[PDB]
């Protein structure tokens, strides 16, 4: 990542305001709703038939919280994402078989979620910093694929 210090502060300031539990559920739910093909990984999650079914599904909510939890940790090691995400990268590839493009889709969904939540506070330049961040995480997560 190429985060100027002022980009790193802006990311950090906003992230302080986020409810990871809530944003987590929102981002994952929205992903399964906007790009329904992504549902392929969650057939044991139950009913994902409609938006309400997805957004309110206790399993989607719980998973979302887990994913954003792992992501928040990533934010504290912005210096070593590849390091931070290595075992997770290995897992997604070797066990889960999750195409890395999924990580970019979720990144974009997340940016929309932050925009949704923060309104005007999500300024053009704050968005640019988050764009760098979600790309770094996606990259980090795809680094161990082979």
């Amino acid at each position: 990542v190429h985060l100027t210090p002022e980009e790193k502060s802006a990311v950090t300031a906003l992230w302080g305001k986020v409810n990871v539990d809530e944003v987590g559920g929102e981002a994952l739910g929205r992903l399964l709703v906007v790009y329904p093909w992504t549902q392929r990984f969650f057939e044991s999650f139950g009913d994902l038939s409609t938006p309400d079914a997805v957004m309110g599904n206790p399993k989607v909510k719980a998973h979302g919280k887990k994913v954003l939890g792992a992501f928040s940790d990533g934010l504290a090691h912005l210096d070593n994402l590849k390091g931070t995400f290595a075992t997770l990268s290995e897992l997604h590839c070797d066990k889960l078989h999750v195409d890395p493009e999924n990580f970019r889709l979720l990144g974009n969904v997340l940016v929309c979620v932050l925009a949704h939540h923060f309104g005007k506070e999500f300024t053009p330049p704050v968005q640019a910093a988050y764009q760098k961040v979600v790309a770094g995480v996606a990259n980090a997560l795809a680094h161990k694929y082979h």
Partner: protein
């Protein structure tokens, strides 16, 4: 393809944009310039400074075109033919840039329409922007 639901969704959300379309158009461009700097290579002739009249002027044109696509949601290929021709033959914008603008358009709406920007509306808007992009790029080769 856009379903009846999608169409209602889009007319509804765009309905709310109303008279802010222009400003929202301008804003989407600025977000795109800042997050995806490679898109600037198409605007070498523009003052891309914050609050550039050029960008403001350009934002209106894009918004007017989108507004026009919503007005003709059942005949977009035809309502947009001219613009399809322009992009294909003169501007020759690489296809991939369309997805970048779309994304920045989604971000702007989200940031402005918290109440309307539901999961379902988000999905409909995404498919819509994808359709518009497809039209604008249909005549490329």
């Amino acid at each position: 393809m856009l379903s009846p639901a999608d169409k209602t969704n889009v007319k509804a959300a765009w309905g709310k944009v109303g008279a802010h379309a222009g400003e929202y158009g301008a804003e989407a461009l600025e977000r795109m310039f800042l997050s995806f700097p490679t898109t600037k290579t198409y605007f070498p002739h523009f003052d891309l400074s914050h609050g550039s009249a050029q960008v403001k002027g350009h934002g209106k044109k894009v918004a007017d075109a989108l507004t026009n696509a919503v007005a003709h949601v059942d005949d977009m290929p035809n309502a947009l033919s001219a613009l399809s021709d322009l992009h294909a033959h003169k501007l020759r914008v690489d296809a991939v840039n369309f997805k970048l603008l779309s994304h920045c358009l989604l971000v702007t709406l989200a940031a402005h329409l918290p109440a309307e920007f539901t999961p379902a509306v988000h999905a409909s808007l995404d498919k819509f922007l994808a359709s518009v992009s497809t039209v604008l790029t249909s005549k490329y080769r």
